[PDB]
Design a protein around this ligand. Structure first.
Ligand SMILES: [Zn+2]
Length: 107
C-alpha cells in the first residue's frame, strides 16, 4: 500500500522537510500533492505529469514546494503554519488511483 513518510517528522522553523512516497504503483502517470487530509483541487499544491515532467502549481502553492519524479515533495523554509497534513494522489493509466496522507510538525 501507498504510504507517506515525512522526514524529518519534527522540523525546526526555517528548515526543510521531505515527504517520501513508499510503494508507488507501476502503471502510474502522475501525482498531485494537496495540503490537508483529502484530495481537494482548492488545496492543490502541485500536479505533476510523469510523461512530460510538467509541474503545474497552485492554489496552495507558495514559493517553496518541489515535487520530484519519484513523487516525493520537498517543502523548504517551513513556517509554523505548515504544521499539519499533506495528501498525495497517484494517478494511474487506468485511473484506479491511489491516495495517502501525510504529516509533519514545525517547531
Ligand atoms: Zn508545536
Amino acid at each position: 500500500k501507498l504510504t507517506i513518510e515525512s522526514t524529518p517528522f519534527n522540523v525546526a522553523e526555517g528548515k526543510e522537510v521531505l515527504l517520501l512516497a513508499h510503494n508507488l504503483p507501476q502503471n502510474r502517470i502522475g501525482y498531485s500533492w494537496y495540503k490537508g487530509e483529502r484530495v481537494d483541487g482548492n488545496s492543490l499544491i502541485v500536479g505533476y505529469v510523469i510523461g512530460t515532467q510538467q509541474a503545474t502549481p497552485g492554489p496552495a502553492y507558495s514559493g517553496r514546494e518541489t515535487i520530484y519524479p519519484n513523487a516525493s515533495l520537498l517543502i523548504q523554509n517551513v513556517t509554523q503554519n505548515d504544521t499539519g497534513f499533506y495528501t498525495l494522489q497517484v494517478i494511474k493509466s487506468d485511473l484506479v488511483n491511489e491516495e495517502a496522507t501525510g504529516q509533519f510538525h514545525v517547531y
